[PDB]
Amino acid sequence: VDRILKLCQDIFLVRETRELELEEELYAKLIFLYRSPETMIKWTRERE
Amino acid sequence: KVSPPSLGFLAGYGIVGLYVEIVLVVGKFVRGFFSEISHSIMFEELPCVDRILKLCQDIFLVRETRELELEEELYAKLIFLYRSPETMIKWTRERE
Amino acid sequence: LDHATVIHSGDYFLFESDLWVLGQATVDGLTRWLRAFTKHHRTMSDVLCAERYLLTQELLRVGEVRRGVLDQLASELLLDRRLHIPELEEAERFEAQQGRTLRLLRAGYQCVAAHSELLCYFIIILNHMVTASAASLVLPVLVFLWAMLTIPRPSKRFWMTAIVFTEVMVVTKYLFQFPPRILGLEKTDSYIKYDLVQLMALFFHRSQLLCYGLWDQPLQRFFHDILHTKYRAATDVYALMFLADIVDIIIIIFGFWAFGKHSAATDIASSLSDDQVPQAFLFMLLVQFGTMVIDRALYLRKTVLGKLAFQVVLVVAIHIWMFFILPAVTERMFSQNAVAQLWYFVKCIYFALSAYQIRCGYPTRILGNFLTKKYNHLNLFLFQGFRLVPFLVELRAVMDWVWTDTTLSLSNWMCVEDIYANIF
Amino acid sequence: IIKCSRETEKKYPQPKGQKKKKIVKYGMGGLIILFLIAIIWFPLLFMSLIRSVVGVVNQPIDVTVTLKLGGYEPLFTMSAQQPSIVPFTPQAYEELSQQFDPYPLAMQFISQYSPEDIVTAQIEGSSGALWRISPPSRAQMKQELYNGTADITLRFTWNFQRDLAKGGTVEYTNEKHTLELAPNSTARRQLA
Amino acid sequence: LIRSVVGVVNQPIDVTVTLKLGGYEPLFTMSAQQPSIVPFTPQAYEELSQQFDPYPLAMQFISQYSPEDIVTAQIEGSSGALWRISPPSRAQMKQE
Numbered sequence: 001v002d003r004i005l006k007l008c009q010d011i012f013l014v015r016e017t018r019e020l021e022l023e024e025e026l027y028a029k030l031i032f033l034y035r036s037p038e039t040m041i042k043w044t045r046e047r048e
Numbered sequence: 049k050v051s052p053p054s055l056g057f058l059a060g061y062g063i064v065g066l067y068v069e070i071v072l073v074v075g076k077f078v079r080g081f082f083s084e085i086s087h088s089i090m091f092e093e094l095p096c097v098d099r100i101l102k103l104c105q106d107i108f109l110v111r112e113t114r115e116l117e118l119e120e121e122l123y124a125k126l127i128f129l130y131r132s133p134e135t136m137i138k139w140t141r142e143r144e
Numbered sequence: 145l146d147h148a149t150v151i152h153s154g155d156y157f158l159f160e161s162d163l164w165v166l167g168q169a170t171v172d173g174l175t176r177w178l179r180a181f182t183k184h185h186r187t188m189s190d191v192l193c194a195e196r197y198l199l200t201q202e203l204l205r206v207g208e209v210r211r212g213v214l215d216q217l218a219s220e221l222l223l224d225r226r227l228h229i230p231e232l233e234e235a236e237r238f239e240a241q242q243g244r245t246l247r248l249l250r251a252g253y254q255c256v257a258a259h260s261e262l263l264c265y266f267i268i269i270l271n272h273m274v275t276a277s278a279a280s281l282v283l284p285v286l287v288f289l290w291a292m293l294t295i296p297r298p299s300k301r302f303w304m305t306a307i308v309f310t311e312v313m314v315v316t317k318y319l320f321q322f323p324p325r326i327l328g329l330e331k332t333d334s335y336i337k338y339d340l341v342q343l344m345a346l347f348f349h350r351s352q353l354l355c356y357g358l359w360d361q362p363l364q365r366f367f368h369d370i371l372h373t374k375y376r377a378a379t380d381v382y383a384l385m386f387l388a389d390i391v392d393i394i395i396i397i398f399g400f401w402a403f404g405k406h407s408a409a410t411d412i413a414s415s416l417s418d419d420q421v422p423q424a425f426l427f428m429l430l431v432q433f434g435t436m437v438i439d440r441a442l443y444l445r446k447t448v449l450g451k452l453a454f455q456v457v458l459v460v461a462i463h464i465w466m467f468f469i470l471p472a473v474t475e476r477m478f479s480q481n482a483v484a485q486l487w488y489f490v491k492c493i494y495f496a497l498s499a500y501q502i503r504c505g506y507p508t509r510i511l512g513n514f515l516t517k518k519y520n521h522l523n524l525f526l527f528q529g530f531r532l533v534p535f536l537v538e539l540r541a542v543m544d545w546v547w548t549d550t551t552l553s554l555s556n557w558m559c560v561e562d563i564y565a566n567i568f
Numbered sequence: 569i570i571k572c573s574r575e576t577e578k579k580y581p582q583p584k585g586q587k588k589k590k591i592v593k594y595g596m597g598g599l600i601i602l603f604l605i606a607i608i609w610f611p612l613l614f615m616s617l618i619r620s621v622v623g624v625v626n627q628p629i630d631v632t633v634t635l636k637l638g639g640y641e642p643l644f645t646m647s648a649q650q651p652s653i654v655p656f657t658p659q660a661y662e663e664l665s666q667q668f669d670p671y672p673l674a675m676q677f678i679s680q681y682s683p684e685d686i687v688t689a690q691i692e693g694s695s696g697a698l699w700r701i702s703p704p705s706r707a708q709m710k711q712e713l714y715n716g717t718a719d720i721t722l723r724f725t726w727n728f729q730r731d732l733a734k735g736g737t738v739e740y741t742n743e744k745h746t747l748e749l750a751p752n753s754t755a756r757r758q759l760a
Numbered sequence: 761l762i763r764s765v766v767g768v769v770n771q772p773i774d775v776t777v778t779l780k781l782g783g784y785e786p787l788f789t790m791s792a793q794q795p796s797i798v799p800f801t802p803q804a805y806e807e808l809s810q811q812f813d814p815y816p817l818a819m820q821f822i823s824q825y826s827p828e829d830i831v832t833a834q835i836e837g838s839s840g841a842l843w844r845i846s847p848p849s850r851a852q853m854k855q856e
């Protein structure tokens with residue numbers, strides 16, 4: 001879950017860095033990630 | 049000192065019982081209001097639902113138009129739609 | 145085209161990879177911890193003393209070039225690339241090896257000399273806490289207004305002001321030793337309670353400040369201007385403030401009779417079970433809760449002017465409440481009272497943390513939970529316990545959502561928070 | 569429901585990247601936090617209000633008291649009502665406070681009571697009814713008081729009553745105080 | 761466990777008894793307390809058990825009671841108070 005945690009941390013960072021558009025795009029990405037289980041499997045795979 | 053007659057039904061509950069009976073119930077309700085919201089995202093974040101609404105309306109229409117076989121096929125289609133999230137995404141995409 | 149369509153615009157292309165022995169061990173660990181806690185000051189002292197040895201050895205007649213004669217071991221660095229001097233290295237080898245408890249005392253004295261600015265405030269606060277009076281009140285408040293609110297120093301002349309003030313106070317008390325109690329410390333009893341210790345600590349700090357090298361109406365306009373600048377140390381101390389507030393809450397919960405019209409050492413569970421609801425407990429809890437809510441608001445909004453105004457209001461209100469109306473209503477002024485002074489000390493710790501936060505400023509990185517830093521079993525268990533208590537998670541989430549900058553609705557914010565908690 | 573929400577959003581589109589309508593944010597957030605604070609503090613604040621000025625005085629309108637020996641017959645029984653119920657005046661409150669000044673617990677407990685809350689019951693010393701008793705039972709009482717090789721109690725019961733029309737839950741409260749007479753003691757012989 | 765050794769004995773400290781005819785006035789009324797409350801001794805328990813031996817239900821019920829649980833109330837035969845009554849009501853009683 002390192003990638004999802006990183007995504008959440010980037011959302012939190014951009015929330016305070018004021019680049020609000022980046023927050024909107026990241027939230028849309030997270031919603032889509034939780035909307036399709038196949039992309040969830042792809043992102044939750046373990047790398048080298 | 050004793051409570052006025054109007055607020056007596058409050059005074060009936062002891063302060064500790066006033067916490068347990070009312071405060072903890074409200075806390076449990078508000079906690080359950082947002083307990084597991086992530087799980088029910090797939091069916092609650094559809095961009096466009098016009099096609100699914102049209103499918104339901106066709107089911108309702110064929111239910112009364114007597115073409116019962118068409119109702120069976122439409123119900124099977126709807127069940128499959130709700131069975132695979134990828135086809136759900138494909139149908140909930142927004143057109144031109 | 146709009147915000148909502150940006151929310152509902154996601155596709156797959158976004159996701160594309162590219163016994164005695166134990167005692168010896170404990171004292172050795174304590175000495176190691178002190179050394180690690182004052183290592184920077186140890187290195188500072190070492191380089192300064194090496195340079196001083198170079199400066200004094202060359203003192204045959206006169207040292208004429210300030211850089212040149214020192215440049216035998218460009219002028220702006222903090223490192224060590226020097227030569228070796230046998231007496232020095234033999235001195236620290238002697239200090240290091242042959243010592244069991246002498247080194248412990250040496251480390252402790254090195255630590256207290258390294259700070260030299262915290263124990264002064266501590267002694268001032270203790271002296272005021274043991275001798276409550278209008279004479280001994282101005283010094284703590286103006287410590288909380290000048291000393292901790294001057295950024296690129298402790299202060300410029302506040303120290304000399306402190307010496308002059310303790311001067312005049314001790315002279316006046318000595319002359320009066322030949323309602324005065326609230327007016328000052330003029331009573332026919334032990335008069336120099338902690339003035340000697342405070343003076344000695346203050347002058348030791350002055351000596352250290354001089355030897356290690358430093359100094360010793362539009363003015364207030366400039367003062368308030370410098371509290372609004374760019375790129376200070378940028379460190380946040382908030383969880384410590386919250387811990388201090390929780391300690392104050394616990395003290396109030398256990399000790400609350402001492403603020404009532406006559407302390408009786410009564411229990412709180414008995415009073416609530418007997419349906420009594422003491423007034424003082426209620427008022428302290430409301431005041432503390434409001435204070436924490438305002439503090440969290442200020443911290444989330446990330447503003448310093450508001451925080452400074454809140455600090456200057458709160459410190460003066462707390463000081464006015466005690467030494468005054470509070471011992472006026474109950475004749476247990478300060479020394480006889482037991483828990484009021486402990487509560488006041490905790491509140492001074494809180495004030496010091498708040499002033500440090502104001503001076504340092506607010507770091508850009510906030511809104512991270514103060515438990516989600518390292519993923520240990522203890523962290524997981526305690527975070528689950530935190531999320532178990534009613535009304536805390538929802539209240540924290542709503543406060544965050546209201547008082548940070550975002551384009552999301554409350555439901556989307558709750559979705560994000562729940563996702564983050566589950567992933568953590 | 570989803571379609572209704574989508575079309576309601578469509579009717580009032582929002583510019584991309586706009587921070588938020590501050591007015592609605594502050595409104596909703598303030599209402600939610602105020603409701604949470606009220607729910608948290610409701611019992612304590614509400615009861616402290618009842619204990620405060622808003623509380624209604626509950627002055628007993630009748631006090632009875634009986635003294636009874638063993639189980640034979642009530643030796644003494646008497647009542648009292650508003651002609652003999654004396655509400656405390658501020659002056660009498662001052663003497664009551666001054667009497668217990670060297671004790672802090674008493675001062676706190678008294679301080680928890682408003683002047684128009686403490687009343688004095690002036691019970692007549694003489695009984696309010698004849699001591700009906702059967703002569704055989706009186707003889708048995710006297711024999712027990714002389715030669716009874718066992719303890720005999722002396723209950724001093726008191727029993728209040730209050731008015732429920734003003735407000736309350738229970739009308740009657742009561743409590744007995746119980747002594748104990750050892751055999752061959754002076755008290756039993758003197759009663760006999 | 762409560763019904764077993766850990767249970768605390770509940771011995772009545774006062775028994776009253778009244779005999780009343782119709783609704784006129786209590787004809788007889790009397791009390792009793794610890795001088796006249798006789799706790800059963802083991803011997804008296806033996807006679808009580810032997811008396812009801814030819815009946816199993818009585819033996820079971822008695823067996824469910826510890827010796828220091830059954831007490832005898834010795835009520836005085838004579839009334840403990842005068843029979844107060846209005847002469848008209850006494851005449852009405854006699855007529856009834």
Ligand SMILES: CCCCCCCCCCCCCCCCC[C@@H](O)O[C@H](CO[C@H](O)CCCCCCCCCCCCCCC)COP(=O)(O)OCC[N+](C)(C)C
Nearest residue numbers: 189252253256257344345346347348349350351352355356
């Ligand atoms: C059990 C639980 C744990 C705790 C246990 C107790 C721990 C207690 C620890 C107490 C620590 C106290 C530290 C005090 C430090 C004082 C330092 C002060 O005296 O400095 C002097 C200077 O003080 C100032 O001039 C102000 C005047 C202070 C005058 C105080 C005099 C006290 C004399 C005491 C004599 C005691 C004799 C005892 C004989 C047995 C001399 O230093 P100086 O020559 O600047 O050094 C310059 C070079 N440096 C900077 C690198 C160090």
Ligand SMILES: CCCCCCCCCCCCCCCCC[C@@H](O)O[C@H](CO[C@H](O)CCCCCCCCCCCCCCC)COP(=O)(O)OCC[N+](C)(C)C
Nearest residue numbers: 289290294295297299300301302305363364365366367368
């Ligand atoms: C009640 C009856 C008795 C009343 C007695 C009242 C007495 C009042 C006396 C006040 C004396 C004030 C002395 C202040 C000395 C300041 C020394 C100065 O060095 O401090 C500066 C800082 O000064 C402070 O900012 C001044 C703060 C003043 C705050 C006044 C608050 C007054 C509140 C009054 C409330 C009254 C309430 C009611 C009371 C009864 C440091 O500035 P610095 O860092 O070198 O600047 C760097 C830039 N340079 C290089 C160009 C200099």
Ligand SMILES: CCCCCCCC/C=C\CCCCCCCC(=O)O[C@H](COC(=O)CCCCCCC/C=C/CCCCCCCC)COP(=O)(O)OCCN
Nearest residue numbers: 383386387390393394397433436437440511512513514515
């Ligand atoms: C009678 C004794 C009972 C037992 C007492 C035990 C005391 C134990 C001592 C302290 C333990 C502290 C551990 C937790 C530290 C958390 C630090 C922190 O950051 O605090 C905030 C606290 O958040 C809040 O502001 C929440 C509270 C807001 C409302 C005000 C609360 C008022 C005080 C309530 C105390 C509890 C009520 C009962 C008191 C008695 C029993 C404890 C939460 O974390 P974040 O802020 O997200 O992290 C971001 C950091 N970058």
